[PDB]
Every structure is written in C-alpha cells, then in structure tokens.
Amino acid sequence: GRGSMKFLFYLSADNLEIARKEVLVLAERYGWVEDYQFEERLLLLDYAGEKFFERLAYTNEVTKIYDICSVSELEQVFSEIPVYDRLCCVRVKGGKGKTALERKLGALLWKRGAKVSVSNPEIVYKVYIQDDKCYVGLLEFERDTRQFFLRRPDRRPFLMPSAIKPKLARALVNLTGVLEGETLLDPMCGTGSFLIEAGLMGINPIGIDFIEKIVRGCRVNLEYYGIEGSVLLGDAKNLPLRDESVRGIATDYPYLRSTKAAGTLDELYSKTSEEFERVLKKGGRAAIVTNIDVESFFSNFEIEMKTEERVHGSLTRRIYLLRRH
Ligand SMILES: Nc1ncnc2c1ncn2[C@@H]1O[C@H](C[C@@H](N)CC[C@H](N)C(=O)O)[C@@H](O)[C@H]1O
Numbered sequence: 048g049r050g051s052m053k054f055l056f057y058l059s060a061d062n063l064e065i066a067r068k069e070v071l072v073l074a075e076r077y078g079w080v081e082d083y084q085f086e087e088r089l090l091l092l093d094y095a096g097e098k099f100f101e102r103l104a105y106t107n108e109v110t111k112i113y114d115i116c117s118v119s120e121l122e123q124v125f126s127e128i129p130v131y132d133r134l135c136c137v138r139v140k141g142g143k144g145k146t147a148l149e150r151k152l153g154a155l156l157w158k159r160g161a162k163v164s165v166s167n168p169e170i171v172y173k174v175y176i177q178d179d180k181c182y183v184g185l186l187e188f189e190r191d192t193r194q195f196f197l198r199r200p201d202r203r204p205f206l207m208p209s210a211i212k213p214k215l216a217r218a219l220v221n222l223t224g225v226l227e228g229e230t231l232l233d234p235m236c237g238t239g240s241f242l243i244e245a246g247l248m249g250i251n252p253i254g255i256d257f258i259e260k261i262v263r264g265c266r267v268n269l270e271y272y273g274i275e276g277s278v279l280l281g282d283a284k285n286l287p288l289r290d291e292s293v294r295g296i297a298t299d300y301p302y303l304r305s306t307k308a309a310g311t312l313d314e315l316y317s318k319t320s321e322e323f324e325r326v327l328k329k330g331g332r333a334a335i336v337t338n339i340d341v342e343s344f345f346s347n348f349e350i351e352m353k354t355e356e357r358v359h360g361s362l363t364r365r366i367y368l369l370r371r372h
Pocket of ligand 1: 238
C-alpha cells in the first residue's frame with residue numbers, strides 16, 4: 048500500500064515562507080510528497096524517497112514521526128516505541144517541564160532495556176509539544192548552525208560590502224531545487240556567496256560578474272573552499288551561455304542606494320528577465336534578491352513565492368522564487 052513516512056520539520060523562525068518552501072522544493076525534487084501541513088514553526092510531511100535533510104538551511108531539526116498524541120498520552124506511545132541496542136536520550140521542545148518529562152520518558156525507556164545517557168546519545172527521541180499535541184519520533188537531522196557562522200563573508204580571502212550571508216545563500220540555491228551534478232548560475236556573483244553554498248552541496252557552480260577584479264576575487268574564494276567551478280567576466284544582460292543550459296539561477300541584484308536612482312535599474316531587470324528565461328531549462332527556477340518590487344519585470348515567469356526580510360528601516364529585501372512556465 049502506502050509507502051510514505053511522516054516527517055516533522057522544525058523550522059527556523061527567521062523566515063517561515065523561505066523555510067516551508069525550501070523543504071517543499073527539495074522534497075519534490077528528491078522524492079514524492081503524499082501530503083503536507085504547516086502550523087507556525089512546524090511542517091509535517093508525508094514523504095517517500097531520498098533524504099535531502101543535510102542540505103537544509105532554514106530547518107533546525109528533522110524528526111521521523113512514530114505517532115502524534117496528547118500531552119497526557121505520552122506514556123502509552125513510549126511503551127510501544129521501538130527500542131534499539133544503541134545509546135539514547137529523550138529531548139522535549141516547547142511548553143514547560145521539558146527537563147523533568149525528558150528524565151521521566153527516559154526512565155520509562157530504561158525499564159524496557161534501552162541504554163540511556165544524555166551526554167553522547169547515538170539515537171535521540173524527540174517530543175514536539177504544540178497546542179496540546181505531541182509529535183513523537185526519532186531525530187534524523189539537526190542543523191549545525193555554526194557551519195554558516197564559520198562561512199560568513201568576512202572569513203573569506205576576498206571581501207566585498209553587503210555580501211549575502213551563507214544561511215540565506217544556501218536556502219536560495221535550495222529553492223531552485225538544483226541537484227548534485229547540475230548547474231547553478233549566479234549571473235552577478237560578486238564574492239561568490241551562492242556559488243560557494245552550491246559548490247559545497249555538490250552542485251556545479253557558474254558565476255558571471257562584469258568587474259574583472261571581482262571575477263578574480265570570486266575565483267580565489269571558490270579555490271579557498273576547494274570548489275571546482277567557472278567564474279567568467281560578462282554581463283548578466285548578455286549571458287555567454289546557450290539556451291536552456293542551466294537548471295537554476297540564484298542571485299542578489301544591485302540595490303538602489305537612494306530614491307534619486309529610481310528607474311536606473313529598469314534595463315537590468317528587463318534584460319536579465321529575458322536572459323534568465325532563455326538560459327534556464329524548461330520548468331527551471333530563479334531565486335532572486337532585490338531591494339525593490341520587480342514583479343512586473345518578471346511577468347514572463349511564474350512567481351512561486353515572494354517574501355520580505357526587513358533588515359533595517361532603510362532596507363527591505365524582496366525575495367522571489369521564479370519558475371519558467
Ligand atoms: N549587469 C551585471 N552583470 C554582471 N555583473 C554585474 C552586473 N551588475 C552588477 N554586477 C556585479 O554584481 C555584484 C554585486 C551584486 N551581486 C549585488 C550585491 C548587493 N545587493 C549590492 O547592491 O551591492 C558586483 O560584484 C558587480 O560587479
């Protein structure tokens with residue numbers, strides 16, 4: 048019969064629209080989504096196929112669900128939950144009494160002959176408590192948040208102001224749904240934030256930049272991370288690429304620094320819109336970052352998602368996921 052398994056995704060509060068979309072794009076590329084449901088920081092997925100979890104940037108934790116029950120029904124599910132000869136512990140998230148209930152459910156498991164220690168568990172039982180509903184399962188993935196810190200743009204040999212941060216850079220590459228061995232293009236690559244995240248996930252990156260010094264510097268950064276890719280001198284308005292040659296596009300557009308510069312970027316948006324549609328494979332995606340509303344320039348695409356990230360009172364990033372019809 049049914050081959051899907053229930054998985055819980057505990058999402059980063061940073062941006063729930065990016066967080067939900069990321070999971071859904073990758074699940075649809077790696078496997079088959081039977082159903083999905085979202086409630087605040089929780090995303091429940093009935094899914095089959097290849098696990099894509101280690102690529103996630105806006106998901107904090109992924110748990111394989113055994114059962115969903117009430118806060119009063121936790122002792123019944125823990126009496127039937129499968130036991131393994133490997134070291135385990137219980138970890139509760141949300142509500143109050145976390146520490147006491149972990150010790151309580153851990154004791155119940157210890158009575159059934161389970162090896163339980165908090166320090167170095169091999170297996171972690173997770174309890175997500177929300178609206179008097181308990182999501183019980185086994186931890187599959189926990190995002191190492193330090194990874195993104197250690198790759199911050201200021202830690203790379205080549206530095207430029209306002210470079211996209213690795214967590215957002217990885218999530219945007221992920222939103223294109225590009226796979227290992229496929230090509231991700233950043234046509235205004237700069238320091239290479241997007242190319243680095245793509246490269247590290249085994250995607251073949253290609254960057255284009257119209258400043259030679261920046262092309263050189265981006266190449267240095269890719270070399271620094273041991274990434275094999277191509278950084279070319281060129282203009283995003285006139286891509287040195289064939290029609291339908293790339294699976295995905297992830298880019299940060301230039302930002303208008305002043306309202307006195309309104310309209311200066313019109314040809315850039317119109318021409319890159321045309322160029323992106325041309326080079327993207329059929330059903331291909333472009334994850335783009337702007338500081339202005341540009342929906343109208345991309346009317347030739349499907350606008351799958353549009354979100355905002357208010358950084359400060361002067362800058363609101365518009366994040367779009369565009370798909371070729
Ligand atoms: N038309 C273009 N073709 C290729 N590279 C470009 C073009 N316009 C800008 N760039 C490059 O894009 C990079 C910066 C952009 N990714 C935008 C970053 C940031 N949002 C900013 O406004 O500065 C720089 O390295 C530029 O050289």
